[PDB]
Every structure is written in structure tokens, then in C-alpha cells.
């Protein structure tokens with residue numbers, strides 16, 4: 001049953017705390033710290049991991065983690081498991097175990113590519129490949145009817161083989177209808193995707209330069225959208241523009257976008 005399926009997923013998501021060794025602080029996220037970690041595997045060997053540290057709230061976290069561990073796609077970050085520690089004040093410490101991605105997030109990578117020591121200039125073909133990877137991961141989530149709600153270049157991770165995966169599922173990424181009536185659909189994730197494509201095409205630029213966050217709703221209300229980046233193919237601009245059609249029903253699905261992006265990439269010499 002649906003219940004029996006949730007119970008299984010819960011047993012698989014929990015990791016024994018003793019199988020985990022924590023390292024240095026990598027940074028400070030939203031909820032709290034992200035640390036380096038070692039995870040003891042079933043085959044005797046240890047794996048480098050990243051550990052994000054944050055009754056009903058604990059149960060919601062467990063249920064949500066149980067769902068995510070079940071996601072299985074090369075362009076979706078895999079949730080390795082969760083640990084629940086307890087503070088000296090008796091406050092729960094939910095820990096989420098993720099793979100360590102030495103190349104880090106896509107946003108930083110793009111910015112670094114514009115500096116001498118950072119990765120070399122990213123050719124157009126590679127930038128389109130990044131968009132195709134995100135579209136593939138989002139197409140997978142969308143089919144499973146799972147909404148991301150925070151898609152941006154900062155939440156996409158680069159694997160060792162340069163594959164991008166969506167992870168972590170900010171007014172300038174939010175669709176016009178989600179700013180007006182707080183309603184969020186898969187088409188709202190499509191809008192966020194269009195914005196993400198523009199972050200990639202500008203190589204890390206903040207969306208809507210010269211437009212303040214408080215004036216974002218009225219900017220869009222008047223039909224204005226993100227401008228075409230310099231040396232962005234018209235075909236690529238048309239694809240990202242279609243993500244920002246006023247009516248969510250007119251916006252393409254992730255499947256259609258993915259197919260448009262793959263064809264455009266194929267056409268490149």
C-alpha cells in the first residue's frame with residue numbers, strides 16, 4: 001500500500017550516526033552549516049560526503065527526505081541519507097547526507113570561468129550542455145509531480161565528469177503568478193528554469209540588472225522580461241523567453257524544452 005511504500009522509504013533513509021565522521025565547515029547555508037564528511041559504506045570503504053545541518057517538523061523532514069532518497073536520475077542530486085542528532089538544549093539537529101561535488105555549484109563555476117585562475121572560458125556548446133542537464137533533471141522531477149520551488153544556477157551542482165544535477169529542492173526567479181496569488185505549479189518551475197538558462201548564458205550575471213527587487217512585480221506586470229544576452233543565439237533566447245509567457249499554460253513543459261535544447265545543441269559545429 002501507499003503507507004507500506006512510505007514505511008520502507010523511511011527505513012532506507014536513516015543513517016547510523018557512528019557510520020559518519022564530520023570534517024571542516026564548507027560554509028553557512030540557509031538553515032545552518034554545511035560540513036565535509038566521511039560515510040562508512042556497506043563494502044568497508046569510506047566515501048567523501050557533504051553534510052547539511054538544520055516531533056511533527058522532525059517527522060515532515062523524515063518523510064520529505066524519504067521521498068528524495070527515492071529519486072534516481074543522473075541529473076538529480078542523490079540524497080544518501082539522514083541523521084537526527086540532539087542539541088544540549090534538547091532541540092533536534094536534522095542532518096542531510098549528500099555526495100561531495102568538488103567542482104561546487106554552477107553559479108560560482110560560471111563566475112570563476114571569468115577569472116584567470118578559475119576554469120577556462122566556457123564554450124557555447126558546454127553552456128548549452130549545462131541547460132540540457134538541468135532540463136533532464138527537471139523533466140524527471142516534473143514527471144514524478146515533484147515541485148523544486150527554488151531552481152537557480154546556485155542550486156545546480158557540477159559532478160566530476162562535468163554533468164550538472166539539480167539540488168536543494170529570491171524574487172528574481174519567481175514567476176509572475178506566484179508573486180501575485182502565491183500559487184506554484186510545474187510551469188512556475190519552468191519560469192525559474194528560463195531565468196537559470198539566462199544565468200548560464202550571461203555566465204553568472206544577477207537577473208534584471210538595474211531593476212530593484214521591490215519593483216520586480218510591476219516590471220513583469222508591464223510585460224518586461226530578461227534581456228537577450230550578448231552573443232546568445234536567437235534560437236536559445238526564444239527558448240528561454242517561452243519560459244516567461246504571462247499565462248502558465250502557454251509555457252512549454254520541461255520535456256518540450258529539453259527536446260528544443262538537445263536539437264539546438266546538435267546543430268552546433
Ligand SMILES: CNc1nc(OC2CCCC2)nc2c1ncn2Cc1c(F)cccc1F
Nearest residue numbers: 026027028034050098099100101104167168
Ligand atoms: C565544493 N562542494 C560543495 N560545497 C558545498 O558548499 C556548501 C553550500 C553552501 C555553503 C557550503 N556544498 C556541497 C558541495 N558538494 C556537495 N554539497 C552539498 C550541497 C549541495 F550539493 C547542494 C546544495 C547545498 C549543499 F549543501
